[PDB]
Please model this.
Amino acid sequence: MKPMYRSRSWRRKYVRTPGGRVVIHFERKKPKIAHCAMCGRPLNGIPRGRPVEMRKLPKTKKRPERPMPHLCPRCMRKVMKEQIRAQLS
Amino acid sequence: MGSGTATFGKRNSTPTHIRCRRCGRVSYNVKKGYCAACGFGRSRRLRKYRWSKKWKKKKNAH
Amino acid sequence: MARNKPLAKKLRLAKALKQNRRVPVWVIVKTNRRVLTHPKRRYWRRTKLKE
Amino acid sequence: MGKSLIQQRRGKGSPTFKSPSHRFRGAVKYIPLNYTQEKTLRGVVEEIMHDPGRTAPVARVKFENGIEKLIIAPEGLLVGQEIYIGPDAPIAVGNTLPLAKIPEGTYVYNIEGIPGDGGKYVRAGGTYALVVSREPDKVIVQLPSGELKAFNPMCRATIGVVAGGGRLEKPLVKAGKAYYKYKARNKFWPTPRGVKMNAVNHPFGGKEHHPGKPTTTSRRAPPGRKVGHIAARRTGRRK
Amino acid sequence: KVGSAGRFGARYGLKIRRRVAAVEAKMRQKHTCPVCGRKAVKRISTGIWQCQKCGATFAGGAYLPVTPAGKAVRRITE
RNA sequence: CCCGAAACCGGUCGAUCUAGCCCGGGGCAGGGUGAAGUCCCUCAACCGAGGGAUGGAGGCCCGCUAGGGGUGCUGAUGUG
RNA sequence: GGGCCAGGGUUCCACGGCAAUGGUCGUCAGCCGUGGGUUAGUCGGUCCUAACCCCGCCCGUAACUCGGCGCGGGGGAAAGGGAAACGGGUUUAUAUUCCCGUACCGCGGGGGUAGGUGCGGCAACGCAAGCCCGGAGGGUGACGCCUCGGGGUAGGCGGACCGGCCGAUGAGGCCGGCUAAGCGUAUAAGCCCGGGGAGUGCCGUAAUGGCGAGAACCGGGUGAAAGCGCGAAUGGCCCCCCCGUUAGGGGGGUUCCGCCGAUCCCUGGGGCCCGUGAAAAGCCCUCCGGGAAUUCCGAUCCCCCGCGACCGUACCGAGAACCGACACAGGUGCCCCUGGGUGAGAAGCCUAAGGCGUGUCGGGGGAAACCCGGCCGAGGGAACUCGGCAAACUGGCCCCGUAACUUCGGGAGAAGGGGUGCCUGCGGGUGCGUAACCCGCAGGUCGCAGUGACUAGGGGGGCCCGACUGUUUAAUAAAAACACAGGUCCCAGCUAGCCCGAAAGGGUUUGUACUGGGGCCGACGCCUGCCCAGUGCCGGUAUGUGAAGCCCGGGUACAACCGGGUGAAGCACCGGUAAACGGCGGGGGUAACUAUAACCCUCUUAAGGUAGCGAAAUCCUUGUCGGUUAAAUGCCGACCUGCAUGAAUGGCGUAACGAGGUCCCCGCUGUCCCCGGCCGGGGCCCGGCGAAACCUCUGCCUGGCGCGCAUGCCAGGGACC
RNA sequence: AGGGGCCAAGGGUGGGGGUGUUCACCCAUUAAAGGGGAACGUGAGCUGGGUUUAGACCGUCGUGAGACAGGUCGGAUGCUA
Model:
């Protein structure tokens, strides 16, 4: 296409027309692994997808059911222990 | 730079100078945003000078 | 791409193109020898421009 | 006569001699609008980063009034250490309190010179100031140069030492690796000598290797002629 | 005899590469976490050290986790 | 009488050449050598000794890869 | 050759031509004439913001069309970030856009139902999302370097089948056999979760290595690419048999099986570091919830109605559309870097798809001399020349073997010696079962030669310089110069020092003595003597001295004016200071003997050349001696009295390194003795095409003369164009 | 076999080693290995090492810039009669 250089948004799959023309297509970059951030671990039940694709996809992928889907269940495993200690005293 | 002038000259290719919104001469340098001839972008005023330049065309016009 | 003209620049290019005609023969009759040569004739290659 | 010199260019703030300020990291602020007295203030080390232009490691700190600011990192800090600011801060390492509140004979850094201006003193890798004597009038602190400056007792400072020591213990290795460091900082280089610079370029030294006039220069000497050993009291290593 | 000094080749001269071989060798050594105490700490970066086990990251010397200057601070007391 | 140059000065106009500085991108066949780091065997109480593996560093080598430079031929040209 | 960015700007495309233009003709064309063509919800612009910029305001300036800060706003990438689409068909020219098919963005409705504003599963977890204006917060957007391994498939090739073709014999070879974006349903190494419970402590990866903050080992969950189906019997390839001036067509059949080998692309580990490696628009979630809720509500679930503000799209993109005045052998970005054979190869050669024969003047002379490219030369082996310059030789690869020196890293691919083809038959490795490759072994055998071509280091030693790599006079000097790492001296407590600015103000500085500013020297190894007299710098200064001001005296009806004290920095003056600039000497006399003088006198001017090194990157001079050459104004080693060495205006020495200077040796060789022949392009002729430099004139030669270095004067001679 | 002198240019009068070298020094040969002139013959012929450009170093000199017929490496050779 109009991008020639193999830039980042540019990257390529070979595409065939049946015409046998064989033309280059750009591909969207492949997904970086969202983190817990409260302790650095890639998150189970958290998708990978392209940052555009997440707009037109489903939200189920985008979280787990437990509170703070952003952090890992074990890190939450800290946080509740703290919250109660906090209500108790 | 000195000789080997042929070997050198692949720029000019890029343009930095045009038909001006204000005057119409060939000097509205796209990069500065300044017209060399008229002074548009730089000044509210037209460029005119004792030497002149601008004046000379105008007298010549008369 | 294209490049990549601005709309106006195309208007200007179009004008220069217009200037790059050859007069018509009838004017010429009307004149009865005459202003000729049409003086502007601009060649794509030969000449530049303005832009 | 000759052109402006290598130093005179520097002063213009022209871009070969302009520090990057967009790859560089925060400055120290302690903030005195929540004052020292009537303290309210603890924070948590949010992360630790390297600051390029300080050539030292620096800490991001998340305060508990809701402001985020950098404080120059002490040695032996953990991420999730609590740093306190005030006088009623514990007397331990990385904690920040006034000089009066700090014991005598303890190592200290990041000392204020005007109360509440955020640290303008001892903010380099591995070096530290010593509190030699304290009197309610004035507290005298001994600086990295061996030299004693009197400061107000109501200056802030942090207990401990700076991190990033051994810094000049390791060498720079090669001209390549060095080139790499100077881009990270700002320091006009490769820097040649005036001695084989032409008479136009530089005040001393001609075509070939030998000095013009003496290297040693006045303290009333002109701009653009104040190069060499500047106002040297002595030179050499002998009687 | 050579350290990590083999990278240098013929070059840099004895003292620098000897220094380099020694300083890198000790830099390579397993270091005791200030946080835990197991021998987990490795160098991420210049002056930045991190313990694999506990995950603690802290500032230290460029080559070593602790410098002799840093060591002095502990000794004066809280 | 007329012409004739190197200047000097004043106000302006250039970093599409080029120099360095910065942002954000991209390019560079193939091959070699082989460091640290790590491992094992056999032989010795230890000290070590012999062998082999694994790993893979370099302002590194070879290289008419692309690309950059331009030493000699004082060659070819030298109103190209 | 294919697709494109900039840039060009109609050069594109058709018809009609050739006066001009095209390095020649021209019926051709990029020329001339005349008409025509670039169509976008889903490509990009436009949006964001970077480095950075401007504007108002504040302020400066005599002032501005000038100037830097601080506020506030706005702008900044047609290769950053970023919403969504492909295929086929059609046109003279355009097309992801027009058409056909299939797919889909944004916003705005509508109709249903989950939803008493979600139900259901111990749990690791299930989708038909989560009422709502508002603002808040939080992840992801989001970024340096290089290996290795894991996956994807573009795609190269053998076998088999189906047609087309070529074809001694009817074999073998060539060829067509395709599947899109969009969906639906599946991804799975990373990464969590239960069970279990680390016995000489076990286990793994290609590897480093994990573990009692959960092992070995079993079940789960969980997030890139990938497969199938839809898309799609179509469409698109490929044939066959009929209709014919023509047009418009018709009916058919094939359109396939594996297994095997790869760039890139995407995903984990890991190594690195005195570069620790922008933002935001947007999503996704969460906190609060202004209000509306049971006649209810809401639409992330379905399905369905409507719409798309604006600019761009041609062609070229190049050894003729760019730029160099020229259609210039120049030189400017990407992408195709994995076509086949070759072979380590994006190498060469040959060759495929594809392109061209307009790198645009032809023909003739077997073409003689001469000139450029290039081929070959006996014998001899640098005798040439400043100089082996040029050129030659070696040559790939495998094996053997490998010195001096050394910073132990290297030197080193030292050096030198051997081998290498085809065939026939085996073995090993990896795997799965005989694939795809790779590594060896034996026998037979041909040539002059087996890297036979192309590709493809000549080697060795001493010395000088500079550590190296890099850089340098873009364009007569690439070096010994420069940088350089390392070393040292110096200055400054940040309200600094230094530096810029007319000013306001500013750089360093998101900087704070492990800083950052300025010089000197220039890697390592060993060292760095001695002098503060002179110059310079620095600190200080009773005393003398030292301006204007003020004071006092005098003068003047006032004033000018005259005199003295008071007199700061500055000077005189004192000390320090040479890894500051710099200096670092002369005569005589003397020792068993002839030599010299270890020895002893003398004086300038601060000190008196020390460690070293030395006839030098030392005059005389080709010193002298020795090596080396038959023979060497050389080189090298030595002595050394150095015309006119010497320690950070660095001394000495130095491994490694060099398109550096000089010398020697071996091989080799047309450099030479001494030149020949050949080949191709010119030369030379013809045809067409067609300039320049420069221009008082011209058939002389020799002597004399003369501005003393004459074709022209003078005297002879030669003399047809 | 010489020394010294006359006639005589018809012919001959070399090759190498050092040097940028005309000169000169040496070697081995040779009959002999003569001298001088021709824009110190010969650059619209070559060569371009040296002299006397612009780079650089050392010594001396000079406060310094900077200099040197001192030493030294490198430094283009146009034209269609």
Summary: The helical segments of chain E are 14-28, 68-75. The beta strands of chain E are 41-45, 48-51, 57-59.
